[PDB]
């Protein structure tokens, strides 16, 4: 029954193997509280400021539900740039120093990488990064790792297929970052060659002793795997190489014909939203875990709000 | 003290004479709870997800106030299409399966007819239709019928003038649908000939034994009526027929000179917002019931939230 | 323990010397409630409708936090013009008469001057003006005067520099209005000649016996002053007179070199947001009171919500 060791929750590089495992146990407690028929009061009298610079329905409501299930209450904007309707302009650090006067914890989604760290360094109240523009999405990585542990029973000695746009994929890079803190983890990188995982992750996995292999055969890798983690491939990542897009039509898709060839105890994960890269008919299969994934988000974020505001 | 018989509240064709009368009694209880000076706890620990695809201030706040007066709490978006700011696209069924993880009941206003039914069929939690685009607006019909019963004392043996754009009028069609489940109901259809009520409603009233009559004399019908239910007539419904618009200038208007000729116990109803089709000076008359109409909305929706979440 | 004497909070000309001093004492109580570790229940079961016609993050959250810290709850729109997504148009008085059915107090920010008074005159529930377009911003004036009293210990016998666009400056005019209700107040008007304070304020101060002096030397006035109240000067207020803009570059700026020359017990005030007219390095100085200003906003508005809803 002590202080949470992190002052703020900003970057994947803040969490070790022990910290993670300890947070996952808290999230299992959080799930018990959510399941209960009496309203929790753990965060009674605490207010959360949801500072979003852009609408992001799913993750905003995830955090706001999380606060409410613990007894706390929310302030919300998805128009953080509009600080006053009558006097134009907005400074991140000015917004933080104004809003911390109104609230006990800020959950921020800025448009610009590096914003979450500046907020943390400016605020006298805890800050959680909900999406630092195209940079760190820490709570999404933690809820990916939690779902795996949740659905598989272990993180040590697992095989995980990361599929789709790996070059530009923010959640596959930080999932891959976090898994490498466990033992006997094998990672498959399943993508067309031109959206293939970047070297900074390849050479960090190799420094971590994580085994890693590349493929463009999804069928082949799906059969050997605990976890198929799926992301779309936007057409625009192909540029003028339509021949390569036409080569890639059909092959990086989770559909019935890929469920056919998978272990019965494997899962399909997908941070959502999805385009056509998982057909609707995969939903009926108890191995489609992407909606249970989203639900783990509520627990993980209950956990984080709880550690940051009242401690272990 | 049993389960509410409807799993979801989607379409007018779900409610019979008995169900309605039973819901109206609950809404009279709900009004007592709202009038009380202690905060109700009936829905303590329940969360409502207000999933609106477009801003709709009045009906959104109506439902959100309703939840709060019963002790419950709200999640709210009027930007449901924007599921993530970083990964584009949104699937109705995916949105429902994500958000039901965060909430206990969804109140949805989609842009497309048929959306409310799909949500109900996808969700493992009750769903209320707040506006299925240009289709069913069930809670608005129920609050129209409730106001009539509320202000008139009876639904059996009443005369109700439905006035304005009847061809394209969603609330006049479903008001008319619902009234036909009562006895000795006479309906007047008061409109220019080119926005005159469509045949599917005319031939269902005639199958229900509801007496119905058409007119373009508002003055004439107002004098024989319990209820004048008023809707605007957008100029654009006239197309190139401006001669017909100029013919219609002044005659489909509730003003002092129409109050002059009405029973003292008749009421002016109007789902709002209004353009110029009810002059401001009608507001002072105790027969203008359109604001008491809006207030009945709060009760009816308290009722629905209450039946759906904790039963009769 | 009596009724609050104001039915609504709309205009600076509603508050005398006694009323202000009494409100400031309440706001000091409100600060004690906010500092407490148990959740206040003073406004339990009261709902506030935040009716904003335009996003205005800082003042909206200020009021909403205020309601929550007292135990009350909020309804919120920053899209008040959009009354229904399906039937276009909105009438201020219709919006008020609909929304008062859902709520116990309305906090309104309209786009048009005179809107707050009409709302007050239409509503059967208290109304607070959060910003009547380019007209009265009463709670901002009250939180300016409160900060001065809060940070200086007195309002009688003080010197206050009002700096920036005084011609067009809404908060400097109403700050200046309110200060003139105290004794031995000297006001400096520090600006370029073409955005110099207007005659209606100059001749009311002179009718109040308030001493007032104009300058374009900030350095000179800063040294003699309790309070430097700073506002930006938009380039566009110069029109084609760029020569005058180039003359004004650098001289109406609060930076270290102006802190150097000020009393140790003087304060920098600025309603925010700020452009470049206060360098970031002024923030470290304990005399920069603009963030403590914003925090006083929470107290003052707690006070107002409390007087209006449950009395002294
Ligand atoms: O096909 C997809 C869908 C989502 N995402 C990632 O998942 C995140 C989901 O978190 P949020 O945007 O909903 O907060 C997005 O930010 C984005 O990085 C992908 O990489 N690919
Ligand atoms: O002059 C009017 C005003 C409103 N409505 C109807 O009333 C509904 C009010 O419900 P809401 O849009 O406020 O939810 C609208 O959707 C629309 O069908 C009309 O038919 N005519
Ligand atoms: O440089 C500035 C910043 C703000 N304001 C005033 O301060 C108010 C702050 O209140 P709000 O717009 O945040 O409610 C604005 O409305 C505006 O009148 C200025 O005059 N100058």
UniProtKB/TrEMBL annotation, chains A, B, C:
Catalytic activity: carbamoyl phosphate + L-aspartate = N-carbamoyl-L-aspartate + phosphate + H(+)
Residues of the Aspartate/ornithine carbamoyltransferase carbamoyl-P binding domain: 8-149
Pathway: Pyrimidine metabolism; UMP biosynthesis via de novo pathway; (S)-dihydroorotate from bicarbonate: step 2/3
Gene Ontology biological process terms from the UniProt entry: 'de novo' pyrimidine nucleobase biosynthetic process; 'de novo' UMP biosynthetic process; amino acid metabolic process
EC number: 2.1.3.2
Keywords of this entry: Allosteric enzyme, Pyrimidine biosynthesis, Transferase
Recorded superkingdom: Eukaryota
GO molecular function (one): aspartate carbamoyltransferase activity
EC class: transferase
Ranges in coiled-coil conformation: none
Limits of the Aspartate/ornithine carbamoyltransferase Asp/Orn-binding domain: 156-307
Subunit structure: Homotrimer.
Function field: Catalyzes the condensation of carbamoyl phosphate and aspartate to form carbamoyl aspartate and inorganic phosphate, the committed step in the de novo pyrimidine nucleotide biosynthesis pathway.
Family: Belongs to the aspartate/ornithine carbamoyltransferase superfamily. ATCase family.
Name listed for the protein in its UniProt record: aspartate carbamoyltransferase
Protein's organism: Arabidopsis thaliana
Taxonomy of the source species: Eukaryota, Viridiplantae, Streptophyta, Embryophyta, Tracheophyta
Parent-protein start and end of this portion: 82 to 390 of 390
């Amino acid at each position: 029954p002590h202080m949470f060791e992190l002052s703020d929750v900003i970057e994947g590089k803040q969490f070790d193997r022990e910290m993670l495992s300890a947070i996952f146990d808290v999230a299992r407690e959080m799930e018990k509280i959510e399941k209960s028929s009496s309203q929790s009061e753990i965060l009674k009298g605490y207010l959360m400021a949801t500072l979003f610079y852009e609408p992001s329905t799913r993750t905003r409501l995830s955090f706001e539900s999380a606060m409410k299930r613990l007894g706390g209450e929310v302030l919300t904007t998805e128009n953080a740039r509009e600080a006053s309707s009558a006097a134009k302009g907005e400074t991140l650090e000015d917004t933080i120093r104004t809003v911390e006067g109104y609230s006990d914890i800020i959950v921020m989604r800025h448009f610009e990488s590096g914003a979450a760290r500046k907020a943390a360094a400016t605020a006298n109240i805890p800050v959680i990064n909900a999406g630092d523009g195209p940079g760190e999405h820490p709570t999404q990585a933690l809820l990916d790792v939690y779902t795996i542990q949740s659905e598989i029973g272990k993180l040590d000695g697992i095989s995980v297929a990361l599929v789709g746009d790996l070059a530009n994929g923010r959640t596959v890079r930080s999932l891959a970052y976090l898994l490498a803190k466990f033992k006997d983890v094998k990672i498959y990188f399943v993508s067309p060659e031109i959206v293939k995982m970047k070297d900074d992750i390849k050479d960090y996995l190799t420094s971590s002793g994580v085994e890693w292999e590349e493929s463009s055969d999804l069928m082949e890798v799906a059969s050997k795997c605990d976890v198929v983690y799926q992301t779309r491939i936007q057409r625009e990542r192909f540029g003028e190489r339509l021949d390569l897009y036409e080569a890639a039509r059909g092959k990086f898709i989770v559909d019935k014909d890929l469920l056919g060839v998978m272990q019965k105890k494997a899962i399909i994960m997908h941070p959502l939203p999805r385009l056509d890269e998982i057909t609707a008919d995969v939903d009926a299969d108890p191995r489609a875990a992407y909606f249970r994934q989203a639900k783990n988000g509520l627990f993980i974020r209950m956990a984080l709000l709880k550690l940051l505001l009242v401690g272990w």
